[PDB]
């Protein structure tokens, strides 16, 4: 179930059993990688670029066609985001919750949400540091979070 | 550090004299007066209280009227909003 | 009308009865008689009856159509005492209490909106309207409950019908529109597209503010029978 919520919901994408380029596929692996870089230049978060390739184009799974996941392709060209996107999205959510709370000190429920989002940021950050994706130097500073977004 | 354990932090000067209630009220009132509030125009927290009712930005050099121990009193802040909403309605 | 003609009790030993007449739009103009103490030091009787408020049923106001709108009532306040006859202007309307109660039911959603409207004249009035949801014909479930999207859309809809109906019209036009029930009807047609609805009626309309000396407004309201328009 959800770490900070009591919901037991299971909405999960299930990838196809046969990992193959679509029968209707007409594009090379490099062609997809060159397209991916253009969206990376646009700055689109990696989850979004996968959605765009699936909906705007028709590559259902990048691994099936290119042979690599989108983040691995970004890392190869050095077009990877410095913070793994998953941490960035929580950090951005925490920044907004902090801003709303600064206007209202009476929103006790909002403070509750801030503790959980910040706790998730700290938990995920430790994993990234251990993996070496992020530096041992990384520490979460609420004060520097907005600056960290850039 | 932690030279004074309790809220005697700004009230250490008064010593044993004056009673706890007095000092407790002073601990809140004097902490705010001494503190540097943000400048509305400077955008720096360099506003300090020159005199009761007078707070001056140390960067812009602008002098702004305000409450005695706080740059913005809550009743004035409410009226500022009420006047803005009433003006925009009368517009 | 008894004391002016002959003997009645100690208070009504010196009292008068004055005819009260309602606006031109209504089929039976006469409302009734008003008891009033005779002229005194400063208490001139006509000045005493200048601002008395009568509560008339639409069935009494427009008889021969009682079965429809028997519930709807109109509060009317005298503005002039000319001809010895009180001339009244519309000051409020409300549906009867017996009907208000019959409007609510379990397993229904009630939408009440209040919208103050500045009229094309001087008067400022708040239109209180009510609507209820009703079971769709198939209805596998037993509850006429709708999702928020229908609730918001329907309430947005109610404001819009008033916006293009009672939003910019003068008080005599409003009296005809609330009497023929025209504006109540418009909300239902708009609501009918939005959802299955019942009881979409303007329940109350109150005079929030009155332009002073609406004597000219009382000429049009009372004697402009020729300008029925």
């Amino acid at each position: 179930g959800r770490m900070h919520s009591k919901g037991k919901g299971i909405s999960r994408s299930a990838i196809p059993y046969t990992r193959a380029p679509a029968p209707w596929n007409k594009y090379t692996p490099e062609d997809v990688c060159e397209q991916i870089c253009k969206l990376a230049k646009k700055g689109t978060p990696p989850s979004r670029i996968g959605l765009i390739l699936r909906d705007q184009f028709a590559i259902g799974q990048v691994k099936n066609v290119t042979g690599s996941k989108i983040v691995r392709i970004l890392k190869a060209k050095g077009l990877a985001p410095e913070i793994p996107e998953d941490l960035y999205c929580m950090i951005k959510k925490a920044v907004a919750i902090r801003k709303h709370l600064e206007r209202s000190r009476r929103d006790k429920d909002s403070k509750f949400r801030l503790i959980l989002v910040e706790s998730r940021i700290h938990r995920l950050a430790r994993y990234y540091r251990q993996a070496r994706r992020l530096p041992p130097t990384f520490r979460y500073k609420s004060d520097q979070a907005a600056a960290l977004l850039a | 550090m932690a030279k004074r354990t309790k809220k005697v932090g700004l009230t250490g000067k008064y010593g044993t004299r004056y009673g706890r209630a007095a000092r407790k009220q002073l601990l809140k009132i004097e902490t705010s007066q001494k503190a540097k509030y943000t400048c509305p125009f400077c955008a720096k927290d360099k506003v300090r209280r020159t005199a009761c009712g007078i707070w001056t930005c140390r960067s812009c050099s602008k002098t702004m009227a305000g409450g005695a121990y706080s740059l913005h009193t809550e009743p004035a802040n409410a009226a500022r909003a009420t006047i803005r909403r009433l003006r925009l309605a009368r517009e | 009308k008894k004391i002016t003609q002959r003997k009645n009790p100690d208070p009504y030993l010196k009292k008068e009865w004055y005819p009260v007449i309602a606006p031109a739009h209504f089929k039976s103009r006469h409302i009734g008689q008003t008891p009033v103490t005779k002229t005194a030091g400063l208490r001139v009787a006509t000045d005493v009856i200048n601002h008395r408020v009568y509560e008339v049923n639409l069935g009494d106001l427009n008889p021969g159509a009682e079965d429809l709108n028997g519930n709807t009532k109109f509060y009317l306040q005298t503005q002039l005492v000319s001809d010895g006859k009180c001339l009244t202007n519309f000051h409020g309307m409300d549906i009867t209490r017996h009907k208000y109660g019959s409007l609510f039911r379990k397993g229904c959603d009630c939408i009440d909106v209040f919208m103050d409207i500045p009229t094309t004249d001087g008067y400022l009035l708040r239109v209180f309207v009510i609507a209820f949801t009703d079971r769709f014909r198939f209805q596998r479930r037993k509850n006429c409950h709708v999702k928020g999207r229908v609730i918001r859309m329907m309430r947005a809809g109610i404001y819009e019908t008033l916006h293009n109906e009672l939003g910019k019209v003068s008080i005599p036009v409003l009296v005809t529109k609330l009497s023929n029930f025209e504006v109540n009807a418009k909300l239902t047609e708009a609501l009918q597209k939005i959802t299955m609805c019942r009881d979409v009626m303007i329940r109350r309309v109150k005079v929030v503010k009155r332009p002073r000396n609406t004597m000219e407004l009382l000429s049009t309201m009372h004697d402009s029978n020729q300008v029925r328009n």
Binding site: - | - | K1, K2, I3, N8, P9, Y12, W17, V20, I31, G32, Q33, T34, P35, V36, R52, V53, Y54, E55, V56, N57, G59, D60, T96, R97, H98
Partner: protein
């Protein structure tokens, strides 16, 4: 000669009062309590029956051939049921020959009411 009779029913006493349509001037007033010496009998319909009979003579003298009926209980935070004398009030007027015009509830019902006497435990009688 239309007029309106407001009939407080409530409990404790019954008030039968006929007035002008405006309500500004009272043609007549009577109370169930005036008729009965015992305090408990004041809301009872027998006291009320004698009471509206007395009012009929006064009101019919002052014209008032026809009356409209508005009937209210204590209302507000109390009862909301007319209680005892209310049923008699229309009946005695019908015996008198006053003609009914329209009947209505004048209960002062409260949207979002103020607190009522009794406490959370209630009247522990």
């Amino acid at each position: 000669a239309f007029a309106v009779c407001h009939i407080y029913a409530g409990k404790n006493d019954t008030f039968i009062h006929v007035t002008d349509l405006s309500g500004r001037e009272t043609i007549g007033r009577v109370s169930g309590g005036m008729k009965v010496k015992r305090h408990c009998d004041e809301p009872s319909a027998y006291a009320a029956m004698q009471a509206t009979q007395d009012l009929i003579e006064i009101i019919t003298d002052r014209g008032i051939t026809a009356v409209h009926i508005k009937i209210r209980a204590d209302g507000g935070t109390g009862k909301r049921v007319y209680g005892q004398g209310g049923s008699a009030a229309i009946r005695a007027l019908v015996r008198g020959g006053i003609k009914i015009g329209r009947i209505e509830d004048s209960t002062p019902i409260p949207t979002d009411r103020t607190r009522h006497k009794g406490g959370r435990r209630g009247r522990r009688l």
